């Protein structure tokens, strides 16, 4: 609350529109982090089961232009390109939702006179169901899980996919 | 590390080039450092400077960069 | 995920995204009452 108000004072432009450190930003980032944990699980499954075609094939620079060449004389693999385009799909959905939101949906950028949602605090009420409390709880948990997964991958030396698999118990692959 | 062996024969490279506008001829023309990627050859003399100072490995330069980041902070 | 991917990951960012966002925000700031 104090931090929220102080930020509203420091950066009136972002806070007035709902950007920055706000409850709306927390909710949106929790949404994206949950979707991202799902995406990591799904890519783990696909890579483990070999569902990605020509995963280790290096894209041709002659066909796909200089963009197909990586930083240090390396080539982007078909798997990386496929996953990137999969992300491009949801990114275009994102741009369309942000500029032209559904009438019922929550908007990324809030109006000038919008009423900020009440800061939940330590934990929202445990309202079990498709509730805005459950959404925030699971979004916070997913964001923390993303950070923990990256840190475990860097520390233990395993891949992010390997760490997700290990944690899930090797059910994925 | 390969310049501190034959500094009078090896050209010192400043940084790699990643331009999505280069053609294959340009990538090949800029792979002169024996590094297998397009590069810029330094004209600042930092190689000679550091070699004289006592820098021999890339880890020395990396530690120096870490310290200078800490000092900027 | 190796460091060799970092140029291809960053140069488009630093050269098209950072300038675009900076220009938009600075435009909003300079023309604002």
């Amino acid at each position: 609350t104090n931090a929220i108000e102080e930020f509203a004072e420091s950066a009136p432009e972002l806070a007035s529109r709902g950007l920055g450190v706000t409850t709306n930003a927390e909710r949106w980032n929790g949404r994206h982090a949950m979707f991202g944990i799902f995406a990591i699980v799904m890519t783990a499954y696909f890579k483990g089961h070999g569902l990605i075609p020509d995963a280790e094939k290096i894209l041709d620079v002659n066909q796909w232009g200089p963009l197909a060449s990586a930083g240090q004389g390396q080539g982007i693999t078909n798997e990386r390109a496929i996953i990137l385009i999969a992300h491009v799909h949801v990114l275009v959905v994102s741009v369309l939702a942000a500029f032209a939101p559904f009438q019922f949906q929550d908007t990324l950028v809030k109006e000038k006179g919008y009423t900020p949602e009440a800061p939940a605090g330590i934990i929202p009420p445990f309202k079990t169901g498709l509730t805005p409390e459950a959404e925030l709880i699971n979004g916070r948990l997913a964001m923390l899980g993303v950070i923990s997964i990256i840190m475990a991958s860097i520390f233990t030396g395993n891949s992010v996919i390997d760490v997700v698999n290990l944690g899930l118990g090797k059910i994925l692959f | 590390e390969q310049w501190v062996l034959n500094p009078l024969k090896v050209k010192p490279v400043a940084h790699a080039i990643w331009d999505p506008h280069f053609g294959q001829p340009a990538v090949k023309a800029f792979t002169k450092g024996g590094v297998f990627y397009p590069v810029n050859i330094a004209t600042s003399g930092v190689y000679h400077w550091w070699y004289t100072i006592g820098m021999r490995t890339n880890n020395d330069l990396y530690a120096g960069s870490l310290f200078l980041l800490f000092l900027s902070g | 995920m190796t460091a060799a991917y970092l140029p291809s990951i960053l140069v488009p960012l630093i050269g098209l995204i950072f300038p675009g966002f900076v220009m938009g925000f600075a435009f909003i700031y300079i023309e604002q009452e």
Binding site: - | E1, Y62 | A3
Partner: peptide
């Protein structure tokens, strides 16, 4: 020779310096 962990430590220090630079920019803008 320079490992990805090393590049990541460098990036973390860069991020800390960026945070401090934003703080200094605010304090100077005042």
């Amino acid at each position: 020779m320079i490992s990805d962990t090393q590049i990541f430590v460098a990036l973390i220090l860069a991020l800390v310096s960026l945070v401090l630079a934003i703080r200094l920019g605010t304090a100077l803008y005042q």
